[PDB]
Amino acid sequence: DSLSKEKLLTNLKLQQSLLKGNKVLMKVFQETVINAGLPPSEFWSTRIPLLRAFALSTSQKVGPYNVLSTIKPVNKVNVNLSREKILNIFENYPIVKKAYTDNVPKNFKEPEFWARFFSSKLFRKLRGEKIMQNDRGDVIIDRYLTLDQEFDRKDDDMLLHPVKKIIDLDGNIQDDPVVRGNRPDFTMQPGVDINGNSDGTVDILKGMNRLSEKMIMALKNEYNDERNELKIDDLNESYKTNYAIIHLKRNAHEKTTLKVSNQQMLQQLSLVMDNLINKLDLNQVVPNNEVSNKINKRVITAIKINAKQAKHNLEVKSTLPIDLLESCRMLHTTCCEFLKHFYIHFQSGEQKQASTVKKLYNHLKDCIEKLNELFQDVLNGDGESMSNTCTAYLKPVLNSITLATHKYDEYFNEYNN
């Protein structure tokens, strides 16, 4: 289905679809392929989960439901039609879909059609309403009555299937074919009208049963056992988890990249217990104001250093021209995209990746030179008034990029040379 990497890369229409959904994706994609000419497959190669998420979001569909039962008759009536529910009616009733498609594009209007439909007795029949000759219906819609009837016959023919003997009430009533007793009660048998005909409640009940069967066979779509069926689980062994416990052997390496004696510590301990019981003065704790002044110097130095650390506690406010700010952000973004794709190629590790690595190396070099030329532009646009800040802002991505270039050169010298 539409789930492989090849399928997701193939769906150019879906790619354009979420392209048109976003705006920074036009920005990024335009710079990536319209401006830089990157292979758009490798563009989308990162965004594969996003593509699949968009596809699966677009791909779901609802389950069937009794749309005619949700239809209410609502003096006068005003049509308040919902197109999704109109298509729901179409899907649930292909007869109604057909009656739409041979009359509205031929004879009259859609709201006129639906007014005729709500007027029609075919609507009442298809809904849970007993038909009545007092009702006149709509003649145009009610011409489809026998067509819907033969649809019902064909659908019932489809719905017929053999039954399991474990639950077969037909086999149950065919237990004794020579039962000769008495005629059962009118109460508990299906009653009829005065002239022997039925009222049709059996028809409406078999119709709603047909609706249920159509439901469940819509569920039963494309998208022996009695031994298991008759198991009595209540007298069986309880399930126990096979979860594995874990122990932990403990032997850690010592930290890598004079010794005191009991006599000497005991001597000092005796002496300091003697000093402890001897004396203790709070007043002697006051310092000499000179070594204390050096303490003041050290403390104040630490305060100054950490205060300058705290002095640099939406992005930050900047005094850039907004266009050059956007241009440099754009350049940073496409350089980051290039760098990530180059790392993807490099960490992949194949000889098939070699030309890709070389070409992305060329692109990184081009980005470097374009960064330098941008620095020349902000040079002769500022006189290095705040072109220094431009260079420093674009610095760390450039450092990482050129570090990657050095890594590529080093591995080239490692393998080839």
Binding site: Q16, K20, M26, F29, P40
Partner: peptide, 21 residues
């Protein structure tokens, strides 16, 4: 190949079309 080129040219038109919009 050649048949991929008109697809990507179709995407070229769509990218330009979304630009003015």
């Amino acid at each position: 190949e050649e048949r991929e080129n008109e697809k990507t040219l179709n995407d070229y038109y769509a990218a330009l079309a979304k630009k003015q919009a």
